[PDB]
């Protein structure tokens, strides 16, 4: 057996599929977006989560084609249900570092946005703070074109890496996403009370939006709301879910 072969097989069989984790406002209300999370519906093993296959996919050279397939499926899934999404609804994708050195990303973003009415969604690209993009004239160009499309850049896993204020201006960052490890420490450890505050301060200084991830408890939610966190994501709000479940919930909220 070849793992690379098997990934190419899975991709050709459209086995990489999107799950959707909702984002809600800091002060509560109806959902304001989703993060798209890849899953592998494997014929024999069931639904495999991405920490089990994305690293291999990155090594193999297949992550870009896999991401493109995911963005195309999301357009197919949600592009015909714009009426269920309040204008400005965020749709976020995790982008691998290789994809950021490829001007093709601009075309993939354009294509996704074309599946919805103009300005109706906000496309967000999430770049992990753990792997800081090495800038070049290509990245300069790419991020300028993405910004001109109206795409937003989020830095996720935030607080776990070592980005600088200069890097945040360089890649035109719109949003920080606080890693779930910091949220998990609310009401338990002082140091991360300080780390979490320090991220909030950085975001107010640079006028960035903040999403807090891993929000599992009301304690956590209230703590984050009291510090002006814009958006919350976590099992308290909603686990990642298949399309049918997302549509069911959106219909309910559309109704209220
Ligand atoms: N226990 C707990 N977990 C929570 C909570 N809130 C969110 N999570 C989980 O944390 C992960 C959030 O995405 P991430 O930090 O980008 O971390 C992601 C991301 O780095 C990567 N990944 C997922 N989808 C893609 C993709 O489309 N492309 C690429 N390149 N990477 C992806 O896989 C990682 C893991 O994804 P998932 O397994 O879907 O796991 C998701 C989500 O289900 C919570 O309250 N409690
Ligand atoms: Mg994704
Ligand atoms: Mg993410
Ligand atoms: Mg994270």
Author numbering: 5 to 259, 261
Give passages from the manuscript.
DGC domains containing the signature GGDEF motif synthesise c-di-GMP from two GTP molecules while EAL1516 and HD-GYP171819 domain-containing PDEs are responsible for the hydrolysis of c-di-GMP to 5′-phosphoguanylyl-(3′-5′)-guanosine (pGpG). Hydrolysis of c-di-GMP by EAL domains has been shown to require the presence of divalent ions, either Mg2+ or Mn2+, with the most efficient reactions occurring at alkaline pH2933. Here we report as yet structurally uncharacterised EAL domains from the core genome of Pseudomonas aeruginosa, PA1727 (MucR) and PA3825.
